[PDB]
């Protein structure tokens, strides 16, 4: 993999956010002769494997079409580990078990699954000390957090390093390999253990090009959210910016170092929250505590697929509590300057936040999962591992 | 690249097709040791890749959006050989080098760029006695056929060991990943210097259209059927333009000019090797022929219009068939019910036998190369 050179990267505290970097080339083969480019980058192709073989590849499930997500799988590189976090009717999840096993077994490669509400995850959980996710009902709720708290929690017990997220909504196989070769290019480049790989793919229309009244507001979004993020940090840094183009980048990757660190919000708010974080963590606006991080700094990713991302999902309460989750978190940022609170303010209520004098609900946040004893969790779930385990 | 092992295989002479392969696993990794489940194949990526080093990718493009064939290109396993076969419009042709050169640049690597209508080409034709794509104005004519011919050449020229052809069309550089590295699957699979990959993928157009190609390989395995006796359902790829093949393979195989091409490339492999007739190839009697079938995980969106396009498709194809010195009289005559039954005419007529352009080998390259000899770096793209 080829990939341009950030021209520019926004330091902020001890946080290196770069600016987005295209993929030139998907596979750029064996190298040999280095000629030096001091503006691009080739990524050989044997240590993007041997990250990847540092790597686990999270797939979350909720119901989704089986013949996709095999699909899903069949694109993986075949060094990463492969969980699937499942989330699907008790019998839905049985076929994901049957279809995850044939392929492990098929591609003669190893893989983990599990489900949200799998009670024995709630016990592993408050037995290590991290009760925060569950239900009333006796175990961890659904939620998209929740999910990746599950995530990280197999990712760590498995040894990997890195751990990066996939949309099973993808019906195209080769774009999911570049994606995840994407994380792995991103954590080759990277220079310190706490490193984040923010995928995006970006698309330009016109007055003479279709797009659907629903791809178009989709943008006219995200776009917003982006600059939101730009208005925070440059609330903070004096210096107007624009180096966010990843605020809603829900296929990611991070290094579990990094994860674990971070809290972590439960609706929408997750992806734009993980930045929200990270800079109110490591900004330099706050005594910063940990001294690996202080010592190493972070570096946030965000690298432009050369694959289209066609995920099917629209209408209302999914692109507008997209923006409502996203300016609530700005809003409320141990960050913000009484100005970015006000801008953000208006386009909420001035779009529906039941006014005058309205205000988001503030987030809610699970804390870091260095908190959680991954010792008694591994205690907690010894007799169990042969079933989430798939031979 | 795991995948499966085809069902069965049609022996035909010495052509043996095999049934469709579908890529189970997109990469499989580095094998350092062998459980080898042989209810598959799996591929190491150093083989892929050593053969991808001797392989020639041809993109052909007449006008293409340009963003839609840089996208292409960015798809192209770095081992591979570009070759860009442009007729395009005269200043697009000119973007289009830009483009190339660009691209090749900054990615380190070697591409060849030609245009069909390039006089030059014409002439180098000319020389080494292979005069019968060049046209009424001196020029070689524009069409599907005359494209690979020229294709071919610059990948002989260039040494490379395998040509594989790509659809500019994508809108996916990871389709066009998986496709290249499909086609390198099939001659490391191969066990023999000819070998053939075919790529294939399993809307009220889209019906039609792929009603048509139901139609069409079924006229295909109607003629093997026909010479064996026996009812084949191998053969899924008859209109598979994305196909690859080795050198040796194509500079024999001669050439139908549009539409007929994919086609009459199986008919022909059948006539020549199929072992109904004289077969003096010491070579090709020897090791035989492969075909290869791949289906892949990644859909194929190149946007196709035109309804009456695809009829076309149809007559083409079914004329193919009913035109072979192989086809007995039952499949000369399905052929044309199924025709006239939809276009074809009268209460019979014959549909047009088909131009066939004469194998490659009957070509002398070092007279080419003399030829080309001021000119290859207006095709080297540095
Ligand atoms: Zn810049
Ligand atoms: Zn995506
Ligand atoms: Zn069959
Ligand atoms: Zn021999
Ligand atoms: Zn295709």
């Not at 499930?61 to 699909?71: A, C, F, I, V």
């Not at 893989?111 to 037995?127: G, S, T, V």
């Not at 507008?320 to 386009?347: G, I, N, P």
């Amino acid at each position: 993999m080829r990939l341009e050179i950030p021209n520019h990267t926004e330091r902020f505290g001890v946080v290196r956010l770069h600016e987005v970097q295209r993929i030139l080339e998907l596979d750029s083969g064996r190298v040999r002769d280095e000629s030096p480019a001091v503006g691009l980058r080739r990524l050989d192709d044997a240590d993007l494997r041997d990250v990847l073989e540092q790597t686990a590849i999270v797939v979350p499930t909720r119901n989704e079409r089986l013949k996709l997500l095999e699909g899903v799988l069949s694109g993986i590189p075949h060094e990463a580990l492969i969980l699937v976090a499942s989330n699907s009717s008790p019998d839905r999840f049985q076929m994901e078990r049957d279809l995850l096993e044939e392929f492990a077994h098929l591609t003669e490669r190893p893989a983990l699954i599990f489900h949200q509400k799998d009670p024995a995850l709630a016990e592993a959980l408050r037995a290590g000390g991290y009760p925060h996710p569950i239900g009333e009902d006796g175990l961890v709720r659904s939620g998209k957090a929740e999910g990746m708290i599950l995530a990280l929690v197999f990712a760590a017990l498995s040894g990997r390093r890195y751990v990066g997220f996939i949309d099973a909504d993808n019906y195209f196989p080769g774009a999911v390999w570049e994606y995840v070769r994407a994380y792995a290019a991103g954590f080759l480049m990277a220079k310190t253990p706490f490193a984040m790989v923010r995928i995006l793919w970006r698309y330009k229309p016109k007055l003479t090009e279709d797009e659907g009244v629903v791809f178009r507001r989709y943008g006219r979004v995200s776009e917003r959210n982006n600059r939101a993020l730009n208005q925070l940090i440059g609330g903070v840094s004096g210096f107007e910016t624009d180096v966010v183009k990843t605020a809603n980048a829900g296929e990611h990757a991070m290094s579990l170092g990094l994860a674990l660190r971070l809290p972590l919000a439960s609706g929408y708010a997750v992806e734009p929250q993980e930045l929200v974080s990270l800079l109110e963590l490591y900004g330099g606006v706050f005594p910063l505590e940990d001294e690996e991080v202080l010592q190493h700094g972070v570096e946030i990713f965000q690298i432009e697929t050369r694959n289209p991302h066609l995920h099917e999902n629209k209408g209302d309460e999914h692109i507008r509590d997209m923006l409502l989750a996203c300016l609530a978190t700005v809003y409320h940022s141990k960050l913000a300057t009484e100005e970015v609170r006000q801008s953000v303010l208006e386009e909420l209520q001035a779009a529906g936040a039941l006014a005058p004098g309205e205000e988001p609900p503030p987030p809610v946040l699970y804390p870091p999962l260095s908190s959680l004893d991954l010792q008694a969790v591994r205690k907690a779930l010894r007799g169990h591992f042969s079933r989430f385990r798939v031979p």
